[model samples]
Target chain A: GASMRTLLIRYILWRNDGDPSYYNDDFEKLMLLDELVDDSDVCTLIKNMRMTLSDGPLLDRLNQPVNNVEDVKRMIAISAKVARDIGERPEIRWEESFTILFRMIETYFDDLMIDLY
Target chain B: FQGASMRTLLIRYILWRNDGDPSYYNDDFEKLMLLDELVDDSDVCTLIKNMRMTLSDGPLLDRLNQPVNNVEDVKRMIAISAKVARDIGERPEIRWEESFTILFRMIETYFDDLMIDLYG
Candidate 1:
């Protein structure tokens, strides 16, 4: 069975160039998705990630109402930790992960929607 | 309501208030109309009224009226809300429907304030 963590890691890896510097955008978007959902599992994952990345540039980017590109390395670090956690749960379904990841990506790219302001 | 609809309503409210273009009125009038209908729902109105009644003359109102200058202020607001929710949940006289109704109103107020902070 495909796991949410595995699928997300795959997606991030797929989007990463050789420099692997673009993962923050996706990670921040995932945090936004975390805000939209109330699932305890997802919330715990997000809370853990937030704590782990509390002192990093990724947290600064996540706290901002707008998106920016200066925090990719920290973002990737956060995502890797999240992926590791999710991968530990082998029974998790890819479909669930895909749904969440897809929504995050969609929201990340969606420009017409008003964000923060 | 689902999270998607809640998000849509919040976004629509923000856009409707801040867009400054009359054409947005023409283009997204239905969203506003829907918001009006939701607000006008008898149960919703009662919920809002009750929420106001609870907070209007209380410490909560005092806290809300105070300037929100930083993240700590926001966190305090959330903590206050959680306390209120817990209190409401424990009241034997408060029906479950009423509890949820109050919760919804709290959500609405939170978004309204967030919009003000972002766009005002």
Candidate 2:
């Protein structure tokens, strides 16, 4: 059985994979974020992330194609904002986890940019 | 006969308590009522005790057996659970509203059967 931290890290990795198709592996893993949020310690972070991802410019950008470097940069920026918000909580200062997360986002976006150029 | 009477008693309790508050008979309240009534039944009590005995070794039961630090701890737990439910409710893939509709319908049908078994 994976810990909530492990599940969360895996969930972020899946989301950063940037597959927008409905009912895909990424979407299914995103749903699992809800289940992992039941842990009180991780609940706040997960809730904040879910709320952020559900609406606003981040969601709008996610709905559109990652057609260029600018789109990839916007996605990275949103991911960083989510990480910053979650990290601000003293109790849930998941520095190591966020480190891994940001790395994944950077690498994913880098690959996307390389493909485009 | 025992189950019939028990079912009747539970129904009367639910009806007697309904003071016209729209949210009075919500899912959580209904579930709590079911547990309260079921615990009062000797057979159900024995069943629960047996189930507890079987679950005693599990981590979940261990946590259940632990003493709460204070009312605040309990309240926090409830608050966190409610927030999690609300967060899940906002998701498009999981239709919690539809799920609750099915749940209430199932409970209603089960209780109706019990009533029919008692009277007819």
Candidate 3:
């Protein structure tokens, strides 16, 4: 449930699209990786948090060409809206929002992959 | 082909609008190699060469930024993204048409996603 809790908090920001300042202390109750660890080595928490996206195809594309941050951010905002229009939960977390959106766009390339075969 | 000047202008606009700035020169320059492999036209070759000169000389660097919001904008944006991918997007296999398709998808998706987050 720790992982699930972490995702729930992360998704809330992705759904919001922007505005990390919007996160309040209520999120502290979620037992995030950062909270569970008692060490000052923030890097591990950061690494674990990023690990949330390790296997997602979209996250891979998100990091590609690193210069596409704005375009990628735009994609995140766009995908979040699409996900919401379909009546899914809309509050995505920032940590994985870009990853989620890029993965969605990767579907285009996925279809392209099919064409290559 | 619309000539390299046109393509160069297009590349700048795409970088500006989509990414907010056109400072990704490494990617821009690298795209030139792929451009060579793709275009077989003499005019395009001349145009691209001239475009490099124009950029080096710093002439007409801002022409693509003009705001008409119609064919002109589309032409410029498509050219830039098309060119950027040529220079940096690893595979560089996309055509101008493919660039247009991706742009349209981005716009549609951006708007749709914005609405979904705010209200839908």
Candidate 4:
């Protein structure tokens, strides 16, 4: 059975590779910055990123590593860029990601189909 | 004779307890309420068992076993007031308001327990 965490990682990896134009140097930096947040384990990384830009300097400082990596206003800019790329090509929704992950899980573990998520 | 007597007893019980609250009523309808309540609480299982036993003493005794043949049959019967009272009351015929109210209360009380977060 493919675990939900493993599927999430695979989904991120797939998204990273699917579009070439959006996978610029800034995105590379964003991915690396994500390592700090993902690796350090921020519970509400998405929400924190949003609030950081809204509030004063503290969030700005915390986000400085990701923002000042080269020049991007916020992480949402990255989301917007990706969303634009995805929107142009073929709409990527929850079902596609889930189906791809499900197939991968089935191939890896034929005997048991466990729903860890 | 036994079956009729048993039926009468059950109905009487329902009638005895069927009071629908009357201080606010225009006339005295409390007896009907008492009767309804009594029938509502009658033991279906006991009634069935007693009926089978009552029938066991007749010529049919040869066909029916005394100890092994006379098995108790249990059934849950609900007679809604609307169904029984029909056009007199609400659409469902019985005032299932209490049963429904209790069911809703149970869901409200126990919904948290249904979720996995509650197990934690």
Candidate 5:
């Protein structure tokens, strides 16, 4: 996705929380549209997307704002390593690292959604 | 926001990195936007003045080449699909591919989808 790094960084930031929200259904609901609602659904979706797209990660709150691309790349690298420790995958290089982690997320959804049937 | 600078950086980087010449960008891309965010210093959120070039108009959408031979290509494909999803009501089904294609025009309308780098 064009917004891959931003989303990945933010998702890693959210995942780093590993607290209640990570364990809950609301976020996945957000992810899946987390869609298929109605006009008001798109309304809520757009509003939430604005918040999601606009808000920064804990990096700003903890240390400093994510400044340069070098720093940003390292953040994703660390995010990826931690992600791999959480599982395992090929090294997610810089230019090449965009979309798979999203599907890794879908893996969770695919696993979770099976129970509904 | 962390992304604010990176957002500018991504667009600036693409135009610079792909062209292989420093002469292309170098226009105080981030600082002024950071500096002004508002025109009058204009009693508005200054950053609001310079955000989302991807949504706005610019050369980044046209100047650089995003080909499938590289990694960034498929990523752009995803973004295009998203807007198409949005152009429609929003969905994960219904021969969704074909629905998105026609919303614009003919079958060739599929090629009209354009994407610019947001985050590399």
Candidate 6:
């Protein structure tokens, strides 16, 4: 049985994966981010999300470490479905967006399946 | 009932709660919002339980668990939810517009909540 947090992490990752999205193999590392957030230890999640920006798929390109790290930005953008749909409007801070993302996942997707996200 | 499709609808429902104000959504709820309209085998219990997490009021949540049998039940629940929402609001002296905004959502979530209870 997959954890609710893992299912949530899988959800946002799947949404952001674009044309050639992350495969199941690629998802293994990403699942842990939700565990960190799920456990309320978001600092570790934030740190690691930013840590991997340099390791993003566009390896040829270079530069970042701003508030919008590639992965964090991707997650935030996907989370903004709330903004686009009907939750609270997006807050100014990116971290707040992540907060909305996780909390809403907790709220809407508690027993939600790995497949749904 | 495909739980997956309900999951999808629930996502749309959650997003709709954010994208704009609750007014028209409430208006829609008066006619059956996107979510209250259900399908067969749909595990609305999961949906309602998930809703229960966000909604803190025990009585309201409990009543929501019971089926809404008619238009009168709908009206009564809407009113009760509005009163509870006001009582539970951030400040007692909350303004009229702010007050209505809160009332509208409480009503929406109630109707959304009851729609599942009645139909599910």
Every model's TM-score: 0.21, 0.18, 0.20, 0.15, 0.22, 0.24
Candidate 5 or 3, higher DockQ: 5
For model 2, give the RMSD to the true fold. 20.6
Clashing pairs in 1: none
True contacts kept of each: 0.00, 0.00, 0.00, 0.00, 0.00, 0.00
DockQ of each: 0.01, 0.02, 0.02, 0.00, 0.04, 0.05
Supply the global lDDT for candidate 3.
Answer: 0.32
Per-residue lDDT over A1-110 for candidate 6, one digit per residue giving the tens place of the 0 to 100 score: 22333333334434433212223443444444443223333333434334232111221122323232334533433242322222221111222233334433343332
Instruction: State candidate 2's DockQ.
Output: 0.02
lDDT tens digits by residue: candidate 4, A1-117: 112222232224334334342132323423443422232223244344342211111223235343231232233233323322332211123223323323333232222212111
Chain B TM-score for each model? 0.27, 0.22, 0.25, 0.19, 0.23, 0.27
CA displacement after TM-score superposition, residue A82 of candidate 2 (Å): 2.6
Query: What local lDDT score does residue B34 receive in model 5, on the 0 to 100 scale?
Result: 31
Clashing pairs in 5: A29-A34, B37-B46, B37-B47, B38-B46
Cα error of candidate 3 at position A62, Å: 20
> Using TM-score as the measure, what is the rank order of every candidate, best first?
6, 5, 1, 3, 2, 4
lDDT of 5 by residue, A1-117 (tens): 122323343344344334332233323532342122333333333343232322322122223234334344433443433432232111112221222333223223333334322
TM-score: the better of candidates 2 and 3: 3
- Write candidate 3's Cα lDDT for B7-106 as tens digits: 2223233433332322323333333234334333334334344434331121122333434344434334344444443343222122222333334433
Per-residue lDDT tens digits for candidate 5, residues B32-55, read: 223222123231222222222232
Q: Give the clashing pairs for model 2.
A: none
Q: Give the whole-model CA lDDT for all candidates, comma-separated.
A: 0.33, 0.31, 0.32, 0.26, 0.29, 0.33
Docking class of 5: incorrect
- Clashing pairs for model 6 are A85-B15, A85-B19, A86-B15, A86-B16, A86-B17, A86-B18, A86-B19, A87-B17, A87-B18, A87-B19
Span of 10 residues, lowest total lDDT, candidate 3 chain B: B1-10
Q: What interface RMSD do all candidates show, one decimal each?
A: 18.1, 21.1, 20.0, 30.7, 14.7, 18.0
Per-residue error (Å), model 6, residue B65: 6.9
